[PDB]
Symmetry: D2
Subunit: 259 residues, 4 copies
């Protein structure tokens, strides 16, 4: 019950990883405003958490759709303690040499409006409310904001850009708003599952969406993440610490120590 | 309580952050074995927490001592779920020009044996127990592990070195043990130093934090030691930090994202938005 | 001369650093094709370097233009050995609170289409030629690609984004093309901005560098534009930078390793050592 | 002829990568003082570069052996423009679980005295001379100061530590001395050569020691690396940008573009 008397806003939270955040957050005493594209999946979400969660149908790319989401949150809950810019769109890990000349301009704009511009507006929209409550932002980054091969050029640049957002907003919004980011990866949400545990994830297992929720709960806990601003907790099963020939270094440790 | 029924081993956990971690972890249900140089301070917490904490007097540079603590924790509690190598020595932020040629070699060894080697024996000792419980290692680092002026050549080099521990240990101990690092910043710890290093400069070059905070902490305040225990509990919680290994949490109040003319860039926000 | 007989394609290479790069590369024996928005400035250098440089007037956001330049370089010089995507737009370091709601969406696209998309079409265009000559891509980044207060939300996000280009392009174009990044810092460039962003604040928030240098540059001086061309030549040289791909050169005078109270920590060194 | 009228000091430079630096540096008009353990290989080096290179027999761990090396350089060349702390000792990539209880203390001290303490003294020794000439330091780091599996815990910590040295010395020695570091890796100097190009090095080829020399020449060039201080140029064939399933992303690019 770590988030008792708390209010959080989550974009793109009516599905995928953002939905897991919702369920968990509610299950922590929190109160979650949700901006998303799906009117149906927002209504199903709302009855799932009776009066602990509100949902506003919108387009994360729209600044106005973000201001509304802020306003409605303020309407029902009267405050905003943790904003979680999260709504993201993928590029199918498409290589540059495979992005066609007649599609690159559209593809760029769409992916950048959702992953970067979407995040900007959210923070812009909620700025009054966050300053008012001296709360925090926790962006959803990704393994792809730090290392390649998590996506194509478009995805990688958009997720490296939200690292800049983490840093610049951590600076600009201080001392009244703490900005942070979590970088999840290797998810139950291109690459074979057998090559995933062997050559990608040192931890050796595809974690459930529920297991990616705690890192966010942390940054949203009143006085547990107070020194945190500008922080980037990489949360991808250890993609940036994997070996050359094998992801895991000591798979055979138990019978190296006769445990 | 996140850590009910768990067992933590904190080194240097009788004073400072390492001690706040004990109080926090016990308060979070966990039982805590502690290795530290101070016999008094260990009894001081032994009484305070009753049958939830035990303390072993020894030295972090000694592997025998490290092993003795790891065994003591097994004897009393039956396992090791979280190991927190925390014990650290500051270099008074003494520059290279200020290091005495006759005192430098001695100094190196003193600081590197605690800040780095002490961590290695902490892991070496507790490893069998950690692979058995498929547990975690959470390293105390420092802002001095990522950016300069947090200490002199020696300290900054040590903390940077323990960044390399996180990464290697995360690799080597996959998939059973998780290894990560917490990097504290604006705490008001004295941070002890080596006798091999003289008293020469301890007040007027090692600058106090309150005097300079506007150039160091964006968050615009000095956090209490208890505000730094939250990150470690996070790593200590099995169902919260499961997909986290090789993770580096910069926990310095924004020392790495401070701005040029001042630390924080949004002093005038409430003026500009009306609160 | 390191780059005798080589061919470089610089974008935004008619003014600022991009233009100093032309002068340097020609002076290093290389022939240089240039894409830039200014017809005058391109003729200005066309005459200056004679048959060693050619310029194409167009826009970096346009792939057709990018392709047209890549072809122009083939037509005149016969190949492309080094591509330098350099053309960049500043956001006047305009904060998020200061971005007008009615002007923000327009602004985003303007800046992201040059700083990021412009780079992508630069690579997309010149790629066939680069895989053919097994050449290199050297990206102009910025201190704003690594640490904050070098620009507002938009600019810092763009440059950070092109860090992600370096890494992905380095991966994707292995083993034939090498992709790296140069990250300039204390140059006295005006760095143009978008009309979609108002004149509102251009003198008194976007602070001049000379006023603040003691809080920004450890090196304790503002380097001339010619001092920044050396890193690119390095990547342009086949026998010097062969085992370098995905490399990031922080070229900012020490912006990332500046200290808390002042940029440089060794002001008083010669006093302390006697020179 | 980029280093005409220049003087550089190189530790551990009578063999390995440090020797390649020497040959190249001399071949650039530079003048190289060399501190190393080998008396024979120092003499062979000296006749190889007649009067353009001096060599002083010493132990990099000794501060005094470093001061001498500085003094002798000053004797023959009268100045020191680029110091290159380079002498390094490896741990056989030995895992922690394989470092024996009766050896760990000795092994720690030896590897840390050479890789970290060796570097410190060099900069300490040459400080007067470098400040006097307003020159630079270029440490030899390694892929192992950034990612794991380049060595064991001991090597990785020692090379991560010299990253701290790069940063702290870049700060402390400014504005009079520029500190930098090069991070070479995947060298013709444990791991099979067939798994090296496939899963380790995106560039697909083990580069010669000569090809690792240019990066150092760069940092030592009068007015080509003036803005450089605190810089970390990773020089390992792209170990930190390799994919999950394959090092190289577009091996089959030529016949994807019918070049």
């Amino acid at each position: 019950m770590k988030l008792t008397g708390e209010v959080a806003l989550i974009t793109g939270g009516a599905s995928g990883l953002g939905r897991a955040l919702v369920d968990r957050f509610v299950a922590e005493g929190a109160r979650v405003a949700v901006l998303d594209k799906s009117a149906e999946r927002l209504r199903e979400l709302e009855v799932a958490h009776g009066g602990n969660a509100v949902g506003v149908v919108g387009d994360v790319r729209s600044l106005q759709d973000q201001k509304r989401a802020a306003e409605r949150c303020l309407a029902a809950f009267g405050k905003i303690d943790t904003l979680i810019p999260n709504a993201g769109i993928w590029d199918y890990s498409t290589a540059l040499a495979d992005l066609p000349e007649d599609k690159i301009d559209a593809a760029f704009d769409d992916i950048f409006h959702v992953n970067v511009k979407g995040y900007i507006h959210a923070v812009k929209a909620c700025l009054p409310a966050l300053v008012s409550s001296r709360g925090s932002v926790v962006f959803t980054i990704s393994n792809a904001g730090f290392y390649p091969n998590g996506g194509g050029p478009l995805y990688t640049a958009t997720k490296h850009a939200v690292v800049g957002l983490v840093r610049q907003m951590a600076f600009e919004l201080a001392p009244h708003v703490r900005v942070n980011g979590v970088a999840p990866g290797g998810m139950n949400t291109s690459v074979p599952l057998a090559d995933m545990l062997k050559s990608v994830l040192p931890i050796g297992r595809m974690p459930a969406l529920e297991e990616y929720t705690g890192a966010y709960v942390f940054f949203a806990t009143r006085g547990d993440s107070l020194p945190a601003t500008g922080a980037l907790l990489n949360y991808d099963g250890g993609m940036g610490v994997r070996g050359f020939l094998t992801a895991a270094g000591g798979a055979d440790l138990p019978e190296k120590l006769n445990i």
